[PDB]
Design a protein around this ligand. Structure first.
Ligand code: SF4
Length: 366
C-alpha cells in the first residue's frame, strides 16, 4: 500500500529524469488488454513526460475475430437446425454481443437458437457431457493464454472419444501482430510484452522480434508499478542503444515458457495465415485444427456460404486505427455518442479487453 505508492512516485521521477535527455519522442507499445486497463485505470498516460507515449496495440482476441467467422458460425447453426440437428453454441459473454452486419450471437439467440454464455471451454465440455445426443460447439477465440486451455480440453475429449464436443477455431497468435504493425507503419521503439501470453510462450517466444528488429522488450505483469518499471527500463535500453528482452515477470514467466502447454497446443493446432478484423490478413498468425484432428472442428461437418461484401466495421467506426495504436477511442467521433456499451457500434467497445470499453469504463472524458 504505502510501499506501492512510494515506488510509483520514485519510478515516475526516474522516468521524467531519463526522458529529459531523449532525442525526440519515444513510443512504447503493449499488446495486452489488461495492460491497457492498468494504464488507463491509473492515468499513466497523463503522468508520463510529454515525449513518452504508451501505444495500445491489438491486445483483444475478441475484437479481432473476423466477421466472416462469426457469420459462418451463425450460418452453421441455421443449416444444422434445418436438418433437425439441435446444436448448442457456447461463447464468451463479450463475444456473445460482438456486432456483425448480419447480427450478433445474442441476436441469433433471440431467434430461438440455443446459445449459451460460458466462462470457459471447460463449461462447453461439461455441457457436451450433459447432452450426449446434441452437438455442442464453442465458438473459440483467444490468444495463447486462452488457446492453452482449449488444447487441454481437446486432449481430454480425445482421450474420452467425446464425439459431440466441437469448436470453431479462431485462435490467434500475438507476436505476428507486433511484426505486422511495425512493417505497416505504426511507429514505436520499445515493447511491453504481455504477461499472460508470455507465461505460455516464454521469453523464447518474443526473442525473434528483438533479433530481427532490434526492438528492446520487457515482459511485465499488470500492477501499475510493473508497467511503470517496464517503461523506465525500455527508455534506458533505447537511450543506451541496446536490443534485449528482460523478464520482469519471472514469478510467472519462465524463459522457456510453459513447454507442456506449448506441446499440447501444437498437438491439435497448426499455424496458418489468418484474418484479423479491421486489420487484414496476417501471415502465420492464426491456428486451425490439424488434419489429424479435423473431427473436432465444426466446419469439418457443415459447409456454408458466407455472403460477400460484408464490411468489417459499421460506418464511422475507427476500431481499425485504435487496434493499430494510431488513435485512442477519444479520437473516434462515435465514442460515447452513437457507440457505448449499451449500444455498441464497433467491436472495440463490446470486448472486455477492448480499448474503447476500457476508456469508457474508467470514464475517460478526454
Ligand atoms: S468508439 Fe465504437 S465506433 Fe469508435 S472506434 Fe471504438 S468501437 Fe469503433
Amino acid at each position: 500500500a504505502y510501499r506501492s505508492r512510494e515506488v510509483a512516485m520514485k519510478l515516475v521521477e526516474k522516468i521524467r529524469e531519463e526522458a529529459k535527455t531523449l532525442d525526440g519522442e519515444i513510443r512504447i507499445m503493449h499488446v495486452c488488454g489488461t495492460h491497457e486497463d492498468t494504464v488507463t485505470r491509473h492515468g499513466i498516460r497523463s503522468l508520463l513526460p510529454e515525449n513518452v507515449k504508451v501505444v495500445s496495440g491489438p491486445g483483444c482476441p475478441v475484437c479481432i475475430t473476423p466477421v466472416e467467422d462469426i457469420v459462418a458460425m451463425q450460418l452453421i447453426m441455421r443449416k444444422a437446425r434445418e436438418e433437425g440437428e439441435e446444436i448448442i453454441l457456447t461463447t464468451f459473454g463479450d463475444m456473445y454481443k460482438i456486432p456483425t452486419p448480419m447480427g450478433s450471437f445474442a441476436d441469433l439467440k433471440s431467434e430461438g437458437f440455443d446459445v449459451r454464455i460460458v466462462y470457459g471451454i471447460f463449461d462447453t465440455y461439461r455441457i457436451a457431457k450433459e447432452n450426449p445426443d446434441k452437438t455442442v460447439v464453442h465458438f473459440s477465440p483467444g490468444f495463447e493464454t486462452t488457446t492453452a486451455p482449449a488444447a487441454g480440453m481437446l486432449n481430454v475429449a480425445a482421450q474420452e472419444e467425446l464425439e459431440n464436443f466441437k469448436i470453431y477455431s479462431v485462435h490467434r497468435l500475438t507476436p505476428p501482430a507486433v511484426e505486422v504493425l511495425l512493417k505497416q507503419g505504426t511507429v514505436f521503439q520499445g515493447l511491453i510484452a504481455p504477461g499472460h501470453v508470455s507465461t505460455i510462450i516464454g521469453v523464447k517466444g518474443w526473442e525473434y522480434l528483438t533479433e530481427k528488429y532490434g526492438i528492446p522488450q520487457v515482459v511485465a505483469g499488470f500492477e501499475p508499478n510493473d508497467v511503470l518499471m517496464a517503461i523506465l527500463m525500455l527508455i534506458r535500453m533505447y537511450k543506451e542503444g541496446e536490443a534485449r528482452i528482460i523478464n520482469e515477470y519471472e514469478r510467472a514467466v519462465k524463459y522457456e515458457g510453459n513447454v507442456v502447454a506449448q506441446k499440447m497446443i501444437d498437438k491439435f493446432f497448426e499455424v496458418v495465415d489468418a484474418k484479423w478484423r479491421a486489420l487484414g490478413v496476417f501471415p502465420k498468425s492464426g491456428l486451425e485444427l490439424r488434419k489429424e484432428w479435423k473431427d473436432f472442428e465444426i466446419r469439418s461437418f457443415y459447409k456454408v456460404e458466407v455472403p460477400k461484401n460484408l464490411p468489417d466495421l459499421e460506418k464511422g467506426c475507427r476500431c481499425g486505427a485504435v487496434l493499430r495504436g494510431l488513435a485512442l477511442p477519444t479520437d473516434c467521433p462515435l465514442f460515447g455518442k452513437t457507440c457505448t456499451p449499451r449500444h455498441p457500434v464497433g467491436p472495440c467497445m463490446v470486448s472486455y479487453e477492448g480499448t474503447c470499453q476500457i476508456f469508457y469504463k474508467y470514464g475517460v472524458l478526454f
